[PDB]
Design a protein around this ligand. Structure first.
Ligand code: RBF
Ligand code: CL
Ligand code: CO
Length: 116
């Protein structure tokens, strides 16, 4: 699939998605029009590890890059492992301008090891 990413605007409330790639639409099965403005946690669901969610929240607060692997759900309810790479983007004035999150679909780290 084409590269899956979203870009959010941290200068607006709770990191709304302002751009979603064609690859993100294809991975997640959502249309662009129905994604724009939402927070990326819409992909989460029952099996998502809340301890991983909290690591993400802390990295965003700290404006630090992080990679986590977590369960996400397509629009039709199919589970997938998402290796999510979140990166703050600063402008030439040193000010936070975006976050970008790149999603790779796969159980890269086996769940029994992820859990240790
Ligand atoms: C740019 C960006 C992309 C994100 N992409 C995802 C994602 O693909 N899946 C997910 O479960 N959370 C994602 N999140 C995390 C989610 O939006 C939220 O920050 C955490 O769930 C903590 O509330 C993303 C966050 C940002 C800022
Ligand atoms: Cl957050
Ligand atoms: Co591909």
């Amino acid at each position: 699939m084409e590269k899956s990413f979203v870009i959010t605007d941290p200068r607006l409330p709770d990191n709304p998605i302002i751009f979603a790639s064609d690859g993100f639409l294809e991975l997640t099965e959502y249309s662009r029009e129905e994604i724009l403005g939402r927070n990326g946690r819409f992909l989460q669901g029952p099996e998502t590890d809340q301890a991983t969610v909290q690591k993400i929240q802390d990295a965003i607060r700290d404006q630090r890059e992080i990679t986590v692997q977590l369960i996400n759900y397509t629009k039709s309810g199919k589970k997938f492992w998402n290796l999510l790479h979140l990166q703050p983007m600063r402008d030439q004035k040193g000010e936070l301008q975006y976050f970008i999150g790149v999603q790779l679909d796969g159980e890269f780290i086996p769940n029994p090891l992820l859990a240790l």
